[PDB]
């Protein structure tokens, strides 16, 4: 039976994904990178089969709550109880969950507790002036109390210390769960809100749906700092240490994959739940991974194949940003948030589809241990075992044909059947001679010998 370790997440910025209703396009302007561009909830419903067909088992939507002007991303909330008018109606959103659930797919909403939009009405309500912390910037980022109390980017910082604010937040969190049947929240700006609040928050949402899933965003590349949050009722965290390594390493050839395995060992070290760490190559707050490839003047398609191979075969919960499967280019926000294009070449859509199939099929990729057998200068071999399954992930991130002989690391007299590109490596005298041509990848299941 299904666990969050088994999940593959397709991540969507609602506005930037699929304009499925042309009639809710209010002052949409696709030529202003800070306006609404037209994507909506109808948009997403129409693309459920496309998403599911790729092997994705869950969708994370950027926030859907009514936002003030310029809130095309959803993070400057104006009304916690209202669906953003450009996206749809509440009904449209209930139908979306229904449509995902029909497809066996889970729905995660982005959910914000830290702050309101800049022009939220409460800012004017005299009864609510103690709803907000004193307006101050964050200066010492090493002062965690300052980080929790400051107004990030000048965003009205909610005061969770006030029981009225806390209650309001729990009541909205519980409400969307009881009203729409979502499966989880991706928690924005986790690090700007105090830990004691997450414990209570955690208690409050799971009191309403027992398996309610929480994926927290703690923006930091120190797993020691990120891992603490996991101790406060948050089931999974976004793995920025993974991202920082994966992004850099897979965007150019002849770079060692070894740092990624140390991110693993450190995840085992520091987190209670090392498999429930959301892994990615990019997201809506980062430069597009394709732009890192373009910067290094190297073909982004071949970069993406290697990266996504590792993403889909390593521990954690893969989170592919909409667009990755078309080599969508994009610099810094907002330029990383381009309209999805559905009429491009399908090479990476089919490659991703194979990957998600293999991660579905091969419970060693969702649940197995994770061993580094070999790493030189980008040529890497990993091994993963689960019950009677043993899998071997080979990624040649080097500019040369590589041959690596395994000799005791696998049980002798079998063969490795390459399930990603059709390779075959037969034990010959205990040894497996793994040969990969430059910048290719393979995923092998270890299996009984065959022949003519
Ligand atoms: Ca629309
Ligand atoms: Ca609005
Ligand atoms: Ca705060
Ligand atoms: Ca080495």
Numbering used by the authors: 26 to 477
The authors write:
α-Amylases (EC 3.2.1.1) cleave α-1,4-glycosidic bonds of carbohydrates and oligosaccharides; Hence, these amylolytic enzymes are employed for industrial starch liquefaction and saccharification. GH13 family enzymes have three structural domains: (i) domain A, which forms an N-terminal (β/α)8 fold (TIM barrel) that functions as the catalytic domain; (ii) domain B, which is essential for substrate binding; and (iii) domain C, which forms a β-sandwich designated as a putative saccharide binding site6. Here, we present the first α-amylase structure from Anoxybacillus in the unaffiliated GH13 subfamily. The overall structure resembles previously solved structures of GH13 α-amylases13 and consists of three domains: catalytic domain A containing the active site within its TIM barrel fold (residues 26–139, 187–393), domain B (residues 140–186), and domain C with an all-β fold (residues 394–475).
